[PDB]
């Protein structure tokens, strides 16, 4: 329902964290988010982070709550949400990440141009869950 | 309208290569995952390409592997499937179809091939 | 490699029930969809998401998923349903149809 709501072709367009920035990358390709039968979304992404291309894959494992899954063996909840802003939509997200706990925010839109209005929302959104409120857009590339 | 046109069948000499068209109408055509299907004479459908809308994945069946390349120019809403070193095992109706499952805006993990041309006949025999 | 299997063939009587299998391994973990094809002409999906219909086509098709069995219903069956009928799925980098189920309408 939502699931399938979600699914296709998203642009990253800004990241924030209760944390620091570990490897914060230069260029991000399209996040690509595939549902699944019986309820998962499969999230790939590419990023160039000091010359190389990243591939990443993340399983989001639902859970009974709309909105709410899993991630990374379930140390990681992550809750996904529209923006009011048409076309975007934004993933909160907490628990560990890679060794330490970094509470995190994602913003995503189908159409790369940054969105002043997005963005906005974004940093309200961010703030209000606690932040560095040091709103990172990202550049962007088709292919890595 | 909203449809997919094949061309460019034909009677080929063994070994030899050809090129097929799908004229797409009533969409973008690297919006979405476009197949080809075949289907020799009294049998039924084989899978042989597929290119998802990223442009850059491509899938064969093993039987056609090497031989063929599928691509699309998004300009003339075409899709095109290049076929090499044909053999009597490729003699068939080609049709291009759309996953309408796999979109810029919709992707499940489950192929449903929503439009079909009308298909553009292969005969490879000397 | 992965293989999709189908009874040849069906038969029954116009007002009957046709049942049409297609059998893989843990098929029920996958999507199928359902082809029907006429002669002469082009497939026309039925079925999709294993239970989901297209508009355009009638009630009186549906759809289940369920271990290694997907089967297609045909209730009240009519004279032009007489046609081919396709399972298909996606296995790894693959698109696999089922070998077909020639359901006959006895006239």
């Known amino acids: 329902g939502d699931t399938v709501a979600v699914s296709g072709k998203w642009y990253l367009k800004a990241m924030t964290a209760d944390q620091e920035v570990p490897e914060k990358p230069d260029s991000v390709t399209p996040m690509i988010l595939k549902a699944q039968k019986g309820g998962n979304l499969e999230a790939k992404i590419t990023m160039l982070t000091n010359g190389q291309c990243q591939n990443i894959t993340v399983v989001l494992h639902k859970t009974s709550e709309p909105g709410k899954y899993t991630a990374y063996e379930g140390q990681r909840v992550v809750f996904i949400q529209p923006s009011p802003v048409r076309d975007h939509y934004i993933l909160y997200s907490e628990g560990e990440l890679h060794g330490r706990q970094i509470r995190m925010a994602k913003l995503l839109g189908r159409d790369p141009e940054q969105s002043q209005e997005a963005l906005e929302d974004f940093r309200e959104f961010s703030r209000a869950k606690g932040l560095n409120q040091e709103i990172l857009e990202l550049a962007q590339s088709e292919t890595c | 309208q909203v449809q997919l046109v094949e061309s460019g069948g034909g009677v080929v000499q063994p070994g030899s290569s050809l090129r097929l068209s799908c004229a797409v109408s009533?969409?973008?055509?690297?919006?979405?995952?476009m197949h080809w299907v075949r289907q020799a004479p009294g049998k039924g459908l084989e899978w042989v390409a597929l290119i998802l809308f990223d442009g850059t994945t491509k899938h064969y069946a093993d039987s056609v592997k090497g031989r063929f390349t599928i691509s699309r120019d998004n300009s003339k809403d075409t899709l095109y499937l290049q076929m090499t070193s044909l053999g009597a095992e490729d003699t068939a109706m080609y049709y291009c179809?759309?996953?309408?499952?796999?979109?810029?805006?919709?992707?499940?993990?489950?192929?449903?091939?929503?439009?079909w041309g009308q298909g553009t006949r292969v005969t490879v025999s000397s | 490699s992965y293989e999709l299997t189908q009874p040849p063939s069906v038969s029954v009587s116009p007002g009957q029930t046709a049942n049409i299998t297609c059998s893989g391994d843990?098929?029920?973990?996958?999507?199928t969809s359902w082809y029907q094809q006429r002669p002469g002409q082009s497939p026309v999906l039925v079925i999709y998401?294993?239970?989901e219909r297209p508009s355009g086509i009638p009630e009186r098709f549906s759809g289940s998923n369920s271990g290694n069995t997907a089967t297609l219903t045909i209730s009240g069956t009519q004279a032009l349903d007489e046609a081919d009928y396709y399972c298909?799925?996606?296995?790894?980098?693959?698109?696999?149809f089922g070998g077909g189920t020639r359901l006959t309408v006895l006239g």
């Open positions: 298909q799925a996606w296995d790894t980098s693959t698109v696999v």
């Open positions: 998401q294993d239970i």
């Open positions: 009533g969409f973008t055509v690297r919006s979405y995952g």
């Open positions: 843990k098929l029920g973990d996958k999507f």
């Open positions: 179809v759309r996953d309408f499952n796999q979109f810029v805006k919709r992707f499940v993990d489950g192929p449903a091939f929503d439009l």
